Amino acid sequence: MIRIDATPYPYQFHPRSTALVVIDMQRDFIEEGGFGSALGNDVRPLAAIVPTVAALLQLAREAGMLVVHTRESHLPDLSDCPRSKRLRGNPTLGIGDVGPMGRILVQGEPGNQILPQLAPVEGELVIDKPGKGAFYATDLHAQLQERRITHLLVAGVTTEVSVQTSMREANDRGYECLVIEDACASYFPDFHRITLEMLTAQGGIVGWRTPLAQLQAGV
Amino acid sequence: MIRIDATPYPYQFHPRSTALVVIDMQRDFIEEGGFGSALGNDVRPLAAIVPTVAALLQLAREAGMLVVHTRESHLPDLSDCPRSKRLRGNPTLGIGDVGPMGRILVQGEPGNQILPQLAPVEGELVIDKPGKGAFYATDLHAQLQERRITHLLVAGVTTEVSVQTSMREANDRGYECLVIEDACASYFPDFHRITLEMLTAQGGIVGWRTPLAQLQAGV
């Protein structure tokens, strides 16, 4: 079992009982021409972690861990998109409308694809999720139980939305979760660090956090 | 049909399709010597909201809305308590250990009870949940769908753990959620404030928030 330095105390895991979960690293959220920048978000902090996420993905692949990618996406007919989600924020361009990289948040559109630097390969799970939490309305929990996974390494975007939602759901379902702090990012510096602090408060209420360099030291 | 001034924009609901959800207002969180104290917290800040939660409960009862209470709790044999949750951190006492109000976080124990001043009455729904999120491993989604509930008024403790986890689950499931800002509290004032900001960021990404006085004005 590999033991690495973490907050709030060291985290130990066996690589073959562990999955890396890379959350929502999608072109529309991260690329300068994309829908995220069009809404006036500063995508630079999300772009900034891509080399770190790629290094974590390489570590996981070399260590023989299960790799799980998630995409926030809906069926082209929006049959899995609740009306509340479509109407939220009174948007000019909403879910299913044509944005700069195709229909917004729709399966098969260029904007919906994982960045090519972090693209899934054969033997990796890819989860299309209709919400922020990777476990809601997906078979992720079943797929991890079939593979006897107990431990999750968590990366991706954005820290305070899909990453924290997915880690809080994983914690509730009995997973031991380690969030890789420099392999996550937010549009808001107001939210990134304090989220990671929340997750590991009270002796690890949701789980653990560490930088990629501490994980690399262990393998 | 009832329109409330709220952040990030006004919230509209109908009592016939709205529930009040009161989260984890238990002696295990609010009274010294239970689960919250066992985690090393000073539980004293949560008591300050109990009169505001009581006024919110009265308002919902007088409006004839469905009321849902949640209790974080485990079966006495701990068969619904993941090993990860039991072994997390270094608590003074662990789940199921005997504290001054009985077995910590166990169903039927004095310290696990909802505060008498906030107790359920005949015709309210009471959800025992094994995780922080009110939807995981409960029938809450089915119970609301059977009553055609679309809107949730949300209150309780703690803001950054059970409240925000439950609200994020409810958002993913298509509910429209209004958190009553002064009917929530945290052990950590900064986590309370920033959680409320995250929930309504980006045009209402999780939902809405407003103080009790704005709700009272609308009814």
Author numbering:
A (entry chain A), B (entry chain B): 1 to 219
Task: Provide the authors' own sentences about this structure as they appear in the paper.
However, the inactive mutant C162S was able to produce large cocrystals with biuret. The cocrystal containing biuret, at a concentration of 30 mM biuret, only occupied one of four active sites in the unit cell. Biuret is coordinated by a subset of the residues that coordinate triuret, and it binds in a noncatalytic fashion. The dihedral angle for biuret is fairly planar in this structure and binds in the same place where triuret is planar as well. The closed conformation is observed in all of the chains of the triuret cocrystal as well as for a single chain in the biuret cocrystal, which has biuret bound. The other chains in the biuret cocrystal that do not have biuret bound, as well as the apo WT crystal, are in the open conformation. Biuret shows very low activity and is a very weak inhibitor of TrtA. Inhibition data suggests that biuret is a competitive inhibitor. The biuret cocrystallized with TrtA binding in a noncatalytic fashion suggesting that the glutamine residue has a strong role in binding the substrate and stabilizing the preattack conformation as biuret is fairly planar in this structure.
